[model samples]
Target: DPMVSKGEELFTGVVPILVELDGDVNGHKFSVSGEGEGDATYGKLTLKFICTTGKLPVPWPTLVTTFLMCFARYPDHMKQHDFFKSAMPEGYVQERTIFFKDDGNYKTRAEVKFEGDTLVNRIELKGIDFKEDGNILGHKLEYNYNSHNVYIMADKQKNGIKVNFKIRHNIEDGSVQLADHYQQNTPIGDGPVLLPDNHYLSYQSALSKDPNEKRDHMVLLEFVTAAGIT
Candidate 1:
């Protein structure tokens, strides 16, 4: 489980900036300034989802390539950690754990933490079962994001899960913000899906469907809307 611990640490250390913020935010209207730890800008952000196990042969390699290319400079490779019993599925306990590694195979320890009652931040994959035939599936995925009082669903057709991030935009622009608390899909064609105006943070399904058929599997997470915040 060293990889899991390492991955969690790396996620905690850099995710605040890497996943949360892409580049430096200059002259933004938000109260927070500079790329400290966790800062949100007025533009857009994308969130991407990938699968290490049970995905098609092509997508797994792509996920590996993309992760390496993005976090190559990041030191400290991901290591596995302790396993836990899953609350949803019966007779299912999460056991496999891994950490995020750079192209050179360098990894770091990562940890999942809780911020408070509303904000559920910093959640990432820890490990998977990688086999040559691509028959094995990922097991015992320990997530650190907010699970309490939230809606989460796994969609096999979509090949991903949707979890409510429970974030509210504090900007003054009503047009840019989602009307009626609408959830927007990712807009980016490649790389991670940014958020809002940036991108919808959607992703390619794990299994590419035939020209005519489509897989409809996905995880859904629903949380209380931050409607009155703005």
Candidate 2:
């Protein structure tokens, strides 16, 4: 058995992260388990962008757009949700990836990958303590957010694309868009900074897009990091 200090980041195996919409209010919560950083309680969360054709199969009962909101939500949970199960058309699949730096020109590394129907992305701040205080759901939170947007553009093997650039720039009005998902009675905010648009293989029917002028779009194998200590 492995033993470590608490304030020094001590965790084992992958842990489950709670899925939340307006979590504080009218939000949904679900536990998703996957290859995490020792079920990391301390690590940077780098959002991703993966947009392909939303031609997904109606998983019965669940709306396609709702699935996208979960897409707006989280993937490992989606994978756990087992919502989309389609094969690549003609079995022609591709694996791709890209790279970028942090806002301060630091060699911050981040990436996104797609293979067959599987997908994964990279978080620049790995095994590092991460905390971001915000006025979320009527609460003030403050952590390791040094006010620097560690923005990086990249992706997985499946054919997808990430927005070329923009930190707090392209933040347009809310609704089904990236910054502001379809949350009810809530102020529009950039909670979900990055939305990875993962494409599933299937029919071209029920494809949804939020107009070019707006709207937008991971998980891993055992991710571990150190966090705030008392």
Candidate 3:
């Protein structure tokens, strides 16, 4: 019952991120803030972008999705099997519906199985076209569970500009810490940069101790941007 209780706590509670961002967008310095709320079970996730300069488009989806994947394994537990089954018990497909503010309806479909020592997880988004401007193309993550650490590869594109990123998670002081490393194909000035200067994003989440308090019921989410260079 303890495992079940912990699982419920992880999946049921809504997590929110209150983010403050300060960075240079194409040599234009800007400071902006925003918030996003959602749970680990792929439930309703809402994002709001507030107070910004004209330099960058709204940045809620990327931040929300990065945080969501940190807890993705919670849903896999409901399947009554390990995250990746080793034996060939035929092919398997898992599907779930999700929402994004102003981004429209979306479905996450994943095909996962084990081939020798490698675990293959190919995820695709349905009801959304990435080829169109301002859409995400989905992600492909492969790793060997036998290892202590796992790395994930994800991609998102908007208006013909593409961003490819890698992710990793760590547990510290009862909170889940998520980190993202980004590479962009868009040109910074003249020539197209193969891998732009490394930019990093991070998220931290934990349940509040005071559940009876209305504001404390939601998962406490925090986002921190890398320090800006002068």
Candidate 4:
């Protein structure tokens, strides 16, 4: 268990670096250094971090930290292998676009502005898409409330789909701590970016309809734009 805990810790450290790499915030850089010693029965995993001189704009890095943390919890490789029992599709893609301001002063005000549309034609038609399918991993779009961090959860409700949001900044190590969840209908007009009302929730037919009536469905996620820090 100790080693596993260590693995988890090491995993936590290196995982977020992946998301940090995705964001293009001027002077910010993430470096991951890990070491594994011993084999077969015993091994130790240690990790270190090296960030750039400047910190990212508000909530931008916080959101990224959440994204990577989720990856650490459910890695694509492992999830695909265990959940799908096959390699993930190749054409599938997930993207995040962030908008930030330098302010030309010490304080940088930033927010993550992103819209992602993944095509699952193969997965949709084939019905082979599972949690491992990678198309259903859902996006990590949590917000950071300075001292604490909040995680954004995409959940389902009776009337409509709901997104449960939480913050966790106290976990330290510069990673957001995810805690609590709040449900809301109407992805539109919910947050700075709203899930389009028309966004389709895609899934295999077996889960929703009878096998004979089963067909792929699309779930849409939409958001509206807002001015910086307003």
Candidate 5:
């Protein structure tokens, strides 16, 4: 349709960012059903995944909290749009179902987008779930995630679009902008794991030691790697 025609397939397969929060060491059994809608120039980005409540692992709330918090500025609102399914009946990608490398239904995790020049690049992860199933704490926790959105503006190198920025939520405006991409190597971190073959955009987190300045942002895009796994 005219809507999706403006949408170009930017990425498919698994997201390449690495899951940075956990204790399992298998290393955090998870999968991100990554997706995006927009043109090759600029578009909306989405990421979904699920984790089991085996021992204690990252519980749903904790997961979503830490997930977006890792990214930061968990916005309490989202921009209005006609992002209905009619445009992408099947979506730009379906890695969640086909790439069942993990467990649980692919809960709607995070969605990001940058307007051409509105000084309003945004992402939402206040979470999303289809129905009642998954249980968190006392409630059913299917992999379903919370539904919400956050916005970012006047970032690093651009007026609206963030440069070398990653999707984060729930905390503050958390972004690790390395002014130099040629640090000898794209220094990898818990938030944005810059891989040589990664999809260029990486979502990561960072923390401050100044007590009152305590910060935690990120969550991961966890895209596939050149080695083949995310």
Candidate 6:
């Protein structure tokens, strides 16, 4: 129960960004930027976003490394956050029961465990008056203790897409960056499946000299496809 409670508190200090815009995939754009208490034990978390020509200011290598480190170190930081949740596998159970709901209707229940730096998640869906007894889906994430690298199979299948990330820390400059890549078994149409040309995000943190300060940063660059396109 303590771990469950702690995980839920992971995003307690996180602040959401409010964004409104109208644009085209060709070049239209907008952004979300702000600052607030971070979920980590560092300085305040700074947030930024810039969308232009389908790309963000941060490079993919830096963004992916930071993203993986943040999630791997502070698993709860974005666990319940809508935007980040979409990119993660579901059915993470801490030391207690975890519930899933959509439109106010309970949909699934899950449990999770960690075995020597590897995280294992098991999920069960709700069905006509009875809860499933076995796992309907399973996810495993591997990482090194206190390291800024991680690996996972996106679809939990041996032949599914593989996602990996590593971080490069500049102790002299106090700057950190990420490097990552994704591999898939199938191709998209006639060419290889590729992420939209211009999209990336970043998450970083710094130590605060002041005891009462929080220091973390998140910057995201994303694209909004036109309606009815797909």
lDDT per residue as tens, model 2, 18-127? 21111011122221111211122323222222222232111111111111111111133222211111111111111112111111111122222223333332222111
Off by over 4 Å in 5: 1-7, 12-54, 65-146, 157-230
What TM-score does candidate 2 reach?
0.18
Please, what are the lDDT tens digits per residue for candidate 3 over residues 18-135? 4344433223344444456545454343444333554332222323332223223323323221111211122234344443333333344444333342223344443342222223
lDDT of 2 at 188: 22
Give the range where candidate 1 is weakest over 10 consecutive residues by summed lDDT.
80-89
Most TM-score-accurate candidate: 3
Ranking by lDDT: 3, 6, 5, 4, 1, 2
- Per-candidate TM equals 0.20, 0.18, 0.29, 0.22, 0.22, 0.21
Determine the backbone clash count of candidate 5: 37
Q: Which candidate's lDDT is highest? A: 3
Model 1 over residues 1-230: C-alpha lDDT tens digits? 43334323433332332221111111111111111132111111122322222222222222211121111111222111011101110111111122222111111121213233111222223223233332112211212122122122332343222334222112223211111111111111222211111111222212222344233212212121111111
By TM-score: ranked, best first: 3, 4, 5, 6, 1, 2
Give the range of the ten consecutive residues with the poorest summed lDDT in model 3: 139-148
lDDT digits (tens) for residues 1-230 of candidate 4 = 33234333332332111112222223333322111111111111122222232332222323322221112123322221111101111111222222111111111111111123211111001111123212112223232233222222333342223333333433234434343333232212222221122222111111111245222221111111111111
Candidate 5 per-residue C-alpha lDDT over 57-171 given as tens digits, one digit per residue, 9 for 90 to 100: 3333334322311112111121112121112222211111101111122222222222232111121222222222223222332332223222222222211122122221221
> Cα RMSD to native, each candidate?
21.4, 20.8, 20.1, 21.1, 17.9, 21.7
> lDDT tens string, model 6, 1-230?
33334434443444332322122111223232222223332213333423333433222122212221122222233232222222222322211111212111112222323223232333332222211221111111111112322233233232123333344423223433222233222211232111221122333333222244243223432211111111
Better of 3 and 4 by lDDT: 3
TM-score, cand. 1 vs. native: 0.20
